[PDB]
Structure 1
Amino acid sequence: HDANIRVAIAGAGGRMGRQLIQAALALEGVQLGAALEREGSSLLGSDAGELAGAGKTGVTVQSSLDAVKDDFDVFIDFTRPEGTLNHLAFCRQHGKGMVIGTTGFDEAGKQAIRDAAADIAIVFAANFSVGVNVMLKLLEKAAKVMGDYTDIEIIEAHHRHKVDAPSGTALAMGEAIAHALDKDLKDCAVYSREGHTGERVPGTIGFATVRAGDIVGEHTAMFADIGERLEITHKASSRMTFANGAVRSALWLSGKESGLFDMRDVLDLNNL
């Protein structure tokens, strides 16, 4: 973009690395600091931010943190925990704020992130979608006013290769609702409906799961009464949803140096 805040994207030729580029490129106030790749890297030294399209962007694919350690303000990581912990110690070193989307840390791993945060400002989250998060927060506002009367159902659709049912986002939805109602999902979820099964039990939260084709991800929570239904649905079209939120956080970091934050923090969901 070119704008007050400067961004490096590690994992440059990766699935998210690509998107994180166009995002960075796109979002006002954030400008593409650096673009890293992995040594063996064929996109190395040059192939300068033209994964995201946009021909030429000025910035160039590197391999060294210190080779560029002054081209960027915030470090954006969607890599592997082993890279993460690398990037981590260098970020801490040079007071570089991070945005971490990498998953799969172990416990040792999280503590590190957590400790680094004493000296550096980090955004670490398991879901960078703004839609999802906003959605999880509206779900409890709706649950407080309707949760009691209504029949609450959760319907999710995913591609044919999704191996667990229901998804985690769905379970997360279930959980927000449940907690809004001072209930426990464990005592009211219903994951299947087959055969003869009496009338629906009040207070239950049932789950319906659709697995087909290439569906990136769709989630709907329904608040159904006699006479009406309220639905809040989230449809993900691409992994650009994750990228966008990472970048927004990157822009939000600008001006922090504190601790450990999440999308709630970025999104001020707590005062919504």
Structure 2
Amino acid sequence: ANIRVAIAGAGGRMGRQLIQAALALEGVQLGAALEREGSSLLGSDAGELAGAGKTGVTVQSSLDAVKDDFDVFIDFTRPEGTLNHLAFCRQHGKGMVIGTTGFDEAGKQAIRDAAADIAIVFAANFSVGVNVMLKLLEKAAKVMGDYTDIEIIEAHHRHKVDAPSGTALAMGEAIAHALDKDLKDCAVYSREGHTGERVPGTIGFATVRAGDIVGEHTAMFADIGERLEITHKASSRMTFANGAVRSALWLSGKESGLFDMRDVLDLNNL
């Protein structure tokens, strides 16, 4: 490994995962692991925290302490925290992969500034698969969009509280925009009672909520005689981790900047 990461909030589920990714992903090294001061788990050799442990890395909780230890900060904690780690990384030119999510207009507008000073990367979804699908969608909608019926089906564990999934909507948008139309115009979220006929050109959504489903999404292009279905299935929350690590590694060669998975994955030339 020729580069060091910095899994913030190292002790949580995200962090843990993130640590695993750190190990596995060929080409990255675990330079650091942070955690809330005074948390009992301060001190354990990171690796140990997530399965296999040999790491010469001990979970600290001092930003400035580890200043030396990494090459790029991988932040997936709550906002404020994130905001702060950011000013640091900017002040020190450290580089970050912002998995964190939920900023206000001045948060995103904050991350904007930081950009010139340093190489940030910022995505709403660190899944390679997903980001890819999202692209493939444009392609399909392009060719078959016009004449086929488009439906989007998603399913998530019983606890999710927003319908449909934000990813579904993203899919909706991808398609909608590849067809010069706006999702607000042709979205159909419910089909109940005497509906009538599937209106030409509308996109429909079906939402399943059950069990521990991490996340299953299906894009459907239906014609008479054939249909194409593009589907993504997330088995563990690792998916995103793998995304961020790859993302992180990607940054290995830049000074300033603001990106997302398209850039990383190199998808506009796809």
Question: Could you say which TM-score interval applies, normalised by the shorter chain?
Answer: over 0.9
Please give the alpha-carbon distance, in whole angstroms, between the structure 1 residues aligned to 2:58 and 2:214.
Answer: 31
- Aligned-residue offset at 1:49: 2.1
Say which SS state the counterpart of residue 5 (structure 2) adopts: strand
The structural deviation recorded for 1:51 is 2.5
Query: Residue by residue, what CA displacement relative to the aligned partner does 1:123-152 show, whole Å, maximum 9, x if unpaired?
Result: 111111111111100000000000011111
Q: Mean Cα displacement is larger for which, 140-149 or 52-61?
A: 52-61
Contact 1:159 1:211 in 2 (8 A): yes
Question: 1:56 offset after TM fit, Å?
Answer: 2.2
Deviation at 1:46, TM superposition (A): 2.5
1:215-259 deviation line (CA, Å, top 9, x unaligned): 111000011111111110000111101101100011000001121
Contact 2:45 2:56 in 1 (8 A): no
Distance (Å, rounded) in 2 between the aligned partners of 1:186 and 1:71: 48
Q: Does the Cα contact within 8 Å between 1:35 and 1:49 map onto a contact in 2?
A: no
Give 2:47's aligned residue.
49
Q: CA deviation at 1:85?
A: 1.8
Would you say the 8 A contact 1:150–1:223 is kept in 2? Answer: yes
- Cα deviation for residue 77 of structure 1 reads 0.5
User: Partners in 2 of 1:187 and 1:94 — Cα distance?
Assistant: 46
Q: Distance in 2 between matches of 1:109 and 1:204?
A: 35
**Which has the larger displacement, 61-70 or 27-36?**
61-70
The percent of aligned pairs where both chains have the same amino acid is 100
Q: Please give the alpha-carbon distance, in whole angstroms, between the structure 1 residues aligned to 2:226 and 2:164.
A: 26
Q: What's the CA shift for 1:195?
A: 1.3
Counterpart among 213, 219, 230 of residue 211 in structure 2: 213
Across the aligned residues of Structure 1 and Structure 2, the Cα RMSD in angstroms comes to: 1.0
Number of residues paired by the alignment?
270
Give the structure 1 partner of residue 197 of structure 2.
199
**Structure 2 runs not aligned, ≥5 long:** none
Residue 121 of structure 1 and its aligned partner are, at CA, apart by 0.2
2:74 to 72, 76, 99: 76
Identify, as 1 or 2, the structure richer in strand. Answer: 1
Range moving further from structure 2, 229-238 or 105-114: 105-114
Deviation of 1:48 (Å): 2.6
Q: Shift of residue 200 of structure 1?
A: 1.2
Identify the residue that residue 158 of structure 1 maps to in structure 2. 156
Is the 2:45–2:53 Cα contact (8 Å) retained in structure 1?
no
1:172-206, Cα deviation, whole Å (9 max, x unpaired): 11111011110111111111111112221111111
Give the gaps of 5 or more residues in structure 1.
none
8 Å CA contact 1:166, 1:207 repeated in 2: yes
Aligned to 1:60: 58
Q: Which residue of 1 aligns with 2:251?
A: 253
- Where in structure 2 are the equivalents of 1:75-94 lying within 5 Å? 75-94=73-92
Rounded to whole Å, the distance in 2 between the matches of 1:9 and 1:39 is 15
1:49 and 1:61 in contact (8 A); partners too:
no
Query: Does the Cα contact within 8 Å between 1:34 and 1:61 map onto a contact in 2?
Result: yes
> Could you tell which deviates more after superposition, 29-38 or 99-108?
99-108
Distance in 2, Cα, partners of 1:48 & 1:134: 31
User: Equivalents in 1 of 2:108, 2:183: separation in Å?
Assistant: 26
Residue 143 (structure 2) aligns with: 145
Contact 1:34 1:68 in 2 (8 A): yes
| Aligned equivalent of 1:34, options 19, 32, 35 | 32
Distance, in Å, in 1 between the alignment partners of 2:226 and 2:109 is: 47
Give the Cα–Cα distance (whole angstroms) in 1 for the partners of residues 167 and 153 of structure 2: 11
Contact 2:19–2:46 (Cα < 8 Å) also in 1: no
- 1:211 deviates by 0.7
Q: Which structure has more helix as a fraction of its residues?
A: 2
Aligned counterparts of 2:49 and 2:233: Cα–Cα separation in 1: 25
Instruction: Quote the offset at 1:165 in angstroms.
Output: 1.2
Question: Which of 84, 104, 107 does residue 106 from structure 1 map onto?
Answer: 104
**In 1, are the aligned partners of 2:215 and 2:234 still within 8 Å (CA)?**
yes
